[PDB]
Q: What sequence folds into this?
């Protein structure tokens, strides 16, 4: 016979305290952008991006993260 | 015979406290963008993006995250 | 014989507290955008985007997230 | 004879600029206040104040001030 | 004869610029206040203040000040 008992116990805490959060300034792409092109030949696909793209400001009050995985395999 | 007992127990906490959150400024793409093109030849697909695109400001009060996976496989 | 008992127990909490949230400014694409084109030839598909597109301001009071997966497979 | 010409000229400016103003917290008198009195004798006037009184939060966007006095006296 | 010409000229500026102003916390009088009195005698006037009184938070965006005085006296 085979008995398997799987009783993990989790009383954990993940916690943050912050008195104040702020005065955040993100200013990407303030300068001048000039692109001059003459007599170009493209035979295959082209992807072009010019300017200010995909810039992120991310300011969570907590931003705390907890990842837990359990697996029991029997063969 | 085979007995499998699967009793994980989770009393965990994920928590944040923030006294104040703010005064956030995101200013992408303030500068001038100039694109001059003459005599270009494209034989295949073109994708072009010019200016200020896909910029994100994300300011959650909490933003706390908890991921948990359980799997029991029997063969 | 085979017995499988699957009794996970979850008393978890995910929580945030924020005293105040605000004064958020997102100003993408303030600058001037100029695009001058002469004598261009395109033989295949074209996608073009000019200006200020797909910019996001996302400010949830909580924004807390809890993902849980359970699977039991028997063969 | 007497001539008096009084021609002051004022082209002055007083100015402020503020991008954002806020997330201000004023919390006076959070603690406990206990006052126990036995066998007191007062022969003249009494003024008493107990608790949280006359607390001020003052948050003007400008709050700019200009004072000007002119006087001409003749005897 | 007497001529008096009074022509002061004022082209002055007083100016401020602030990108962001905030996350200000004022918490006076958080502790406990206990006042026990027995067998006191007062023959003249009494003024008493107990607790949290007359606390100020003052947050002007500008708060710029210009004072100017002119006087011409003739005897």
A:
């Amino acid at each position: 016979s085979v008995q398997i008992v799987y009783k993990p116990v989790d009383l954990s805490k993940v916690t943050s305290k912050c008195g104040s959060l702020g005065n955040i300034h993100h200013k990407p792409g303030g300068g001048q952008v000039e692109v001059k092109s003459e007599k170009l030949d493209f035979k295959d696909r082209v992807q072009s991006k010019i300017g200010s793209l995909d810039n992120i400001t991310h300011v969570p009050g907590g931003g705390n993260k907890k990842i837990e995985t359990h697996k029991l395999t029997f063969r």
